[PDB]
């Protein structure tokens, strides 16, 4: 979850060791389309997206990609506009990688407001990856180009929560929306 | 018989607001009382007959 409005976070990575030895899930969201590929990406110590600013983006998050056996382009994925809190729930069970999304405007201080906001299903595709580690991809936008070397110019705000198997009692409104939830544990 | 769900009912075309990913609706007894038309985007309830 994050409340940014400058399109900083626009992708994530998923994998076991984040190298070419095992498979890795690369999900990147552009301004007009989304690219989701399963390949032996050689992730560096600090993966980030480069920009030559407006267009002509360079994928400097990986070093090599050979197998590349699964690709998926939806281009409806996750931006939900630019005018605040976009919550996402990632699940990997039985080989299928489920993704959820929801757009909720923020009208309070820099903190998680009260209430309930149910997330809507986004996409469900099988990747067959033993996902154990992940890292959030963010656009640097240092007003210039940058090489593939790590520890770039970070000088020029997201929440992370872990899920657990819990029992819930969902309450649906008269219109069919979820307005309350109870964590039995 | 929309998507293989056979039975007996009467369509009423209610004003239920279904979501794009939701197509079937069940009651307390898990009986499908509302379905989405495959061709048109209208909402049709399945109510039992007399």
């Amino acid at each position: 979850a994050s409340t940014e409005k400058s399109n900083i976070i626009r992708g994530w990575i998923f994998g076991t060791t984040l190298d070419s030895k095992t498979q890795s899930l690369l999900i990147v969201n552009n301004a007009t389309n989304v690219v989701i590929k399963v390949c032996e990406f050689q992730f560096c110590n600090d993966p980030f997206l480069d920009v030559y600013q407006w267009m002509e983006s360079e994928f400097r998050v990986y070093s090599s990609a050979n197998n590349c056996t699964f690709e998926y382009v939806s281009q409806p994925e996750g931006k939900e506009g630019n005018f605040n809190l976009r919550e996402f729930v990632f699940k990997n069970i039985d080989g299928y990688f489920k993704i959820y999304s929801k757009h909720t405007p923020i009208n309070l201080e820099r903190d998680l407001p009260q209430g309930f906001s149910a997330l809507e299903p986004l996409v469900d595709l099988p990747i067959g990856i033993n996902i154990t580690r992940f890292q959030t991809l963010l656009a640097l936008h240092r007003s210039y180009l940058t090489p593939v070397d790590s520890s770039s110019g970070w000088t020029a705000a997201y929440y992370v929560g872990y899920l657990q198997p819990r029992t819930f009692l969902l309450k649906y409104n008269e219109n069919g929306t979820i307005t309350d939830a109870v964590d039995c544990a | 018989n929309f998507n293989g769900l056979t039975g007996t009912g009467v369509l009423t075309e209610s004003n239920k607001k279904f979501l794009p990913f939701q197509q079937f609706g069940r009651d307390i007894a898990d009986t499908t009382d509302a379905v989405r038309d495959p061709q048109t985007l209208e909402i049709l309830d399945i109510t039992p007959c007399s």
Partner: peptide
């Protein structure tokens, strides 16, 4: 760099498509 917060009543999604 890292902070610790708590989610009060957020994190729920639709389990099925019914």
């Amino acid at each position: 760099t890292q902070s610790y917060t708590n989610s009060f009543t957020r994190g729920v999604y639709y389990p099925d498509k019914v």
